[PDB]
Paper text:
In type III-A CRISPR–Cas systems, the RNA-guided multisubunit Csm effector complex targets both single-stranded RNAs and double-stranded DNAs. In addition to the Csm complex, efficient anti-plasmid immunity mediated by type III-A systems also requires the CRISPR-associated protein Csm6. Csx1 has been shown to be required for the interference activity of a type III-B CRISPR–Cas system in Sulfolobus islandicus. Both Csm6 and Csx1 proteins share an overall architecture defined by an N-terminal CARF domain (CRISPR-associated Rossman fold) and a C-terminal HEPN domain (higher eukaryotes and prokaryotes nucleotide-binding domain) that contains a conserved R-X4-6-H motif.
TtCsm6 crystallization was dependent on the presence of Ni2+ ions, which allowed us to solve the structure using single-wavelength anomalous diffraction (SAD) phasing. The protein crystallized as a homodimer, consistent with size-exclusion chromatography data indicating that the protein is dimeric in solution. The TtCsm6 homodimer resembles an elongated X-shape with overall dimensions of ∼120 Å × 70 Å × 60 Å. Dimerization of TtCsm6 buries ∼2800 Å2 of solvent-accessible surface area per chain and is mediated by two dimer interfaces, one involving the N-terminal CARF domains and the other comprising both the 6H and HEPN domains. The Asn416/His422 side chain pairs from the two HEPN domains bind a single Ni2+ ion in a tetragonal planar coordination. In SmCsm6, the R-X4-6-H motif residues reside in an α helix, whereas the TtCsm6 R-X4-6-H motif adopts an irregular loop conformation, suggesting that the TtCsm6 active center might be distorted as a result of Ni2+ binding. Consistent with the observed ssRNA-selective ribonuclease activity of TtCsm6, the width of the cleft would permit binding of a single-stranded nucleic acid substrate, while sterically excluding double-stranded nucleic acids. Taken together, the structural features of TtCsm6 dimer thus suggest that the protein contains two ligand-binding sites: a putative allosteric ligand-binding site at the interface of the CARF domains, and an ssRNA-binding cleft located at the HEPN domain interface, which harbors the ribonuclease active center.
Residue numbers in the entry:
A (entry chain A): -2 to 167, 170 to 345, 349 to 367, 371 to 464
B (entry chain B): 0 to 15, 22 to 164, 171 to 346, 349 to 367, 371 to 464
Amino acid sequence: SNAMEDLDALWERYREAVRAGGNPQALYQEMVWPALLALWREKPRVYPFPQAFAVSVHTLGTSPEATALAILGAGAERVYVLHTPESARFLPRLRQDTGKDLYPVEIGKSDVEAIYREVKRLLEKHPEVPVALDLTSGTKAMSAGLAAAGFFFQRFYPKVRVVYVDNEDYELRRPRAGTEKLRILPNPHEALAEVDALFAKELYGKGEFGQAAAYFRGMVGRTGNQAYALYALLAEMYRAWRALDFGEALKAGRKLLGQLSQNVWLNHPLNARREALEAQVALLEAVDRFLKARDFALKEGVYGLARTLLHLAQEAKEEAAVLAALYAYRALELLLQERLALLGRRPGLSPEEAEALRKALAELLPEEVRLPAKLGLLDLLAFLRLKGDEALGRLSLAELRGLAGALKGRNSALLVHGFDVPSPKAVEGIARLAQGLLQDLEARTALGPLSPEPVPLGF
Amino acid sequence: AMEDLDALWERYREAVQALYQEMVWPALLALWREKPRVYPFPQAFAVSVHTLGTSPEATALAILGAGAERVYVLHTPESARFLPRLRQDTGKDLYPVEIGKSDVEAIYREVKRLLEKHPEVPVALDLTSGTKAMSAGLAAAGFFFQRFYPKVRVVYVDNLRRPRAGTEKLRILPNPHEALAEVDALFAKELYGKGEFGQAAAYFRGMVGRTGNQAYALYALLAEMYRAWRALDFGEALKAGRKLLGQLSQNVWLNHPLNARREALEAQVALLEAVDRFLKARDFALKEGVYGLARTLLHLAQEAKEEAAVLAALYAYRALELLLQERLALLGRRAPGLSPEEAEALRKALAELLPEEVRLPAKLGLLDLLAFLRLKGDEALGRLSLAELRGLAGALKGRNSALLVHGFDVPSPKAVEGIARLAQGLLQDLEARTALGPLSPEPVPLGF
Ligand code: NI
Ligand code: NI
Ligand code: NI
Ligand code: NI
Ligand code: NI
Ligand code: NI
């Protein structure tokens, strides 16, 4: 590699020329710079891994040489030079040492805002190709602004990379001739493994449990730390729980508690809220078992199911009305059914009862109106309240008559058997009624801490 | 105090580098000590972190300017020889931390540790001194961590051959969003790409509020149309689509990027119109609205298949039910159109499928409706293998048995999958018998 060799020889000759005592600036300009330029012309030195760039953008200040090296090292077809007004005079020489067509763009020395604007415009212009942002030359504000722009815009233009010419200083108070290397400045997200936890925590606070679980699981692979696995389990539980997959939720929670039990994890932050987690997993057990059993005697399973549905209805209430009404309807139906289970039957209708019920329903809304084989929602209200039901007897008639409209419409909704779009006031009425019943049932149940919200992550 | 510094600078230029030291330095120092000059708007800092390269003076002025009680100095091997002068000029004790000159990841690690140590106080990250990799690294770390430590700020000392002594200003470096409002736009696009249509709509609305441009109001109407569509509120979706279409008709917007997809857009809005008609009439003669409703429900089922299997089962059940009901409308029947020879024939058909004493409810269920439609030689259903009808029979019986309707079952993914495939075939058949236009399926690309 002769160019490299005759260059090292020129560096030692330079050493002796400055040891003799000449002004080393001109001795560098004549002795060294054309051989270094030659070395980078023939074979650009890039690290850590070689890359192809379609576009390169370069801040420019006092030192044209390093920018020339950076242009040659990125090897882009299209080249932009973000330069201060003073350094425009350097652009012909920059054009000559480099042999590229340059696109100059003038920027004030303190104008960081303009750096941001120029990067944004340039990425809108080149949105699908690898782009190199070279911060080597310029004021601290220009270079830091370019790096900050690159890393920020990587979120929307993932082929952007930030680069710079790393020079190592080695008597001769100057970088050694052949040691400069074009490097990629690593993104802080890339370079810090554990910061994924921050992202995960953020996503956990907003209830996006699946994505938080993904961040935790991948962090296990990257950093090799198994504590995050536990966090993953937790998020997955809350995902399966919110998805009404109670079996998957219970499985994940049991695995999590079994991990929290080992001595190796006694100091895991999740052990600080261990009581609440055991209460929640207990809820999951009760619900899973009640789903298998369909027995309305197990009050705790009915409670967990209904409460989960009501939580989902309240979360859907503003942006997904039809969904919300579906959830709320199933909750209220379950709760009324447990009320009936307090009595004898699930169908046990005597004719004195059937007649008295036609009376009750008729007086509510015409006694000719007929009653179906399985009891409706308002049907169920009338049968239970007709039997003086404590929480259903407390009902106000003003509310009752306005609910009556919503209660007939349960199977008639878009997502069950009909085409109704729900009236939001009807959704709120169903939800409020369901909530009062949920509270009465909660009173006659054996409950843990009763913590609705997911557990705080502890870090 | 500062006028005095100016007098010293004119006297400097007249007496004209060590004379910059002796003449000017302690007066500049003293100006920064007495009242530090911080811009654009001053503030207090609890923690200060400084990279240190070859220029200890600017770092001294930065340490004074930030006014922090705890000062961390991130220095190179060489830079250690500057630590006394720093302590002498600032009059502060310093926590030194050694770094390599291009060890950027050690800068990132240090900032991370220091922010874990000080999570709820204003922290100034000063990049004035250091290699390009050190300063760029500190700025990058500051802006990245700002999302999780909002009180972090990045700062720097802003500057004949020397800069005039009184003009140095400790400045706060803005992050890109602070300096460029329009990037909230980019955020919108990302949300729009992920399906969170409401948040995209709100973003575009705010952009109209600030920039005063109505094109982003068109984008907001687009996102709101898709949000209402996804929520199965076809009235509001039809509303927003109508208005937007009327705008893209107007001449003021002839170059709007959305017009670049108008042929798709129109079709979708027509679809909404059809659906609205159907929903008001409950009349299965309106084939277009049936197709639009069933297709929306099937898209929702597919997007919920992985994570929300219960919800996806509900969606797919409703789609399949609507499609079978339309197949029934072909024969001019509904839901009660039974005669005894037919009911018995269906008992024998169903029993042969699954024991010939089965009960048929008054109103037909999914499996009952399907077998009945075979008993009437309906074409699309008639070309099912008896094997796959046996394999679908279980999932077809659980129509009202699912957790989200009348029962408690969790779906097997094969059951939801098979019901969604059956409904898909019926949907293609109905697609032949409608004219819904170009009908691009996914949301139209924003066009920027
Ligand atoms: Ni040679
Ligand atoms: Ni990550
Ligand atoms: Ni979401
Ligand atoms: Ni919640
Ligand atoms: Ni039903
Ligand atoms: Ni989709």
